């Protein structure tokens, strides 16, 4: 069985490359961040522009939703994160502490903490309520490309241009695992699987890998796309068939069968590198976002 994602909507409004798209956990909204320093909110089902959230002084590399779909956190070249009340558009807190560009961010599932990664080679853990830094992890020896909490929030996974994925105890800050395969390409993305058993890691050698982190073993490789340059997001699609989804530097969205590793679909339409994809929590909907020559977000829907 293969999906049949078809283009439904093209979303225009960002004035520069879109960096990240994310669906609200409640399925109502899409959030986009851009090099234009703006966050935009869109209807998840019709792509209808909702509003613009402004305040960062430089470009934004990432945005993430709180568990209850009420807050966003954004990571900016201005070396801050900002916590946003989506309904009021207010910046609740500006998180200062990184010494270089903030590249990546996520809430824990309980959305009382934020984790951030930076060009300063550190991972920071922040208290959402106070907007104060709880912990600074000397995580990596090169920029941190991605950070993610596991299912219960007790672990963080980080990835870096230093070629390493690391697993951290949230509470203690201790490094519990270093993961690397038989080469040392920059790691451009990582996240835990929904069931919390696996990490999915992108490397800048055109490869995605599914790891059992507790066993420290590479279980599955996904190849056939182009990824040698940019920090491209990857996703688990779980609403229909069990897929892996990634953008690609050939301007396509790639979809793989998670179990068999075969390509099941390539989505054509963008005019530049697809930097970001996101999978809707309840419907077979993919959002995709592309770089400076395109500046659009696309919404794709499948029967399965």
């Amino acid at each position: 069985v293969k999906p049949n994602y078809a283009l439904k909507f093209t979303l225009a409004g960002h004035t520069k490359a879109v960096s990240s798209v994310k669906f609200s956990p409640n399925g109502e909204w899409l959030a986009s961040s851009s090099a234009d320093k703006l966050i935009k909110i869109w209807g998840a089902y019709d792509g209808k522009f909702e509003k613009t959230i402004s305040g960062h002084k430089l470009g934004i590399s990432d945005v993430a939703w709180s568990s209850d779909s009420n807050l966003l956190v954004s990571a900016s070249d201005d070396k801050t994160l900002k916590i946003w009340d989506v309904s009021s558009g207010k910046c609740l807190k500006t998180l200062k502490g990184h010494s270089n560009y903030v590249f990546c961010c996520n809430f824990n599932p309980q959305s009382n903490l934020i984790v951030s990664g930076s060009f300063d080679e550190s991972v920071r853990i922040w208290d959402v309520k106070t907007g104060k830094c709880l912990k600074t992890l000397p995580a990596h020896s090169d920029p941190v490309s991605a950070v993610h909490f596991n299912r219960d929030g007790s672990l963080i996974v980080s990835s870096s241009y230093d070629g390493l994925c690391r697993i951290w105890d949230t509470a203690s800050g201790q490094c519990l695992k270093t993961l690397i395969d038989d080469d040392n390409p920059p790691v451009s993305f990582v996240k835990f699987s929904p069931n919390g058993k696996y990490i999915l890691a992108a490397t800048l050698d055109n490869t995605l890998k599914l790891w059992d982190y507790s066993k420290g073993k590479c279980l599955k490789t996904y190849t056939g796309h182009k990824n040698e340059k940019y920090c491209i997001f990857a996703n688990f699609s779980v609403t229909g068939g069990k897929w892996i989804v990634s953008g690609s530097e050939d301007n396509l969205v790639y979809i793989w069968n998670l179990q068999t590793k075969e390509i099941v679909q390539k989505l054509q339409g963008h005019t530049d590198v697809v930097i970001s994809t996101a999978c809707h929590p309840t419907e077979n909907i993919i959002a995709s976002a592309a770089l400076e020559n395109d500046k659009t977000i696309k919404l794709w829907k499948s029967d399965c």
């Binding site: 520069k16 879109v18 960096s19 090099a35 560009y101 590249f103 800048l204 940019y230 400076e292």
Partner: peptide, 7 residues
Amino acid sequence: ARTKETA
């Protein structure tokens, strides 16, 4: 930002 950022 991510949109031009390389290794």
